[PDB]
TrEMBL record, chain B:
Organism annotation: Klebsiella phage vB_KpM_FBKp24
Protein name: Major head protein
Source organism, top-level taxon: Viruses
Length: 52, 52
């Protein structure tokens, strides 16, 4: 109807591929990495999105 | 270097595990199962083993 495409914009894709692959970019601001593990444990680089 | 190969062979970029006795022991296999191996990367000597 109108209702269907009104919420899901129809996008045609070539029948040569099993779908469409999507890639996004992120801009994050760096503060510092919390913890050095001399026991080998992970590091967590504290990142937050800029649009925050 | 024509005859021996060690003259023109060296490692200065190899990231091989380094053991720190008493800090990261839980990352490597227990030494009571396999004795430590001595490996040389550049000019520093230290023990290494397999990761669990």
């Amino acid at each position: 109807h109108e209702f269907a495409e009104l919420f899901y914009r129809t996008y045609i894709v070539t029948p040569d591929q099993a779908g469409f692959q999507l890639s996004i970019r992120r801009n994050l601001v760096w503060e510092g990495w919390t913890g050095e593990g001399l026991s080998g444990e992970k590091q967590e680089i504290s990142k937050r999105n800029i649009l925050q | 270097g024509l005859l021996d190969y060690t003259t023109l062979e060296t490692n200065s970029t190899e990231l091989i595990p380094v053991i720190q006795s008493g800090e990261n022991d839980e990352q490597f296999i227990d030494p009571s199962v396999l004795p430590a191996q001595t490996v040389k990367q550049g000019k520093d000597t230290f023990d290494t083993n397999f990761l669990k």
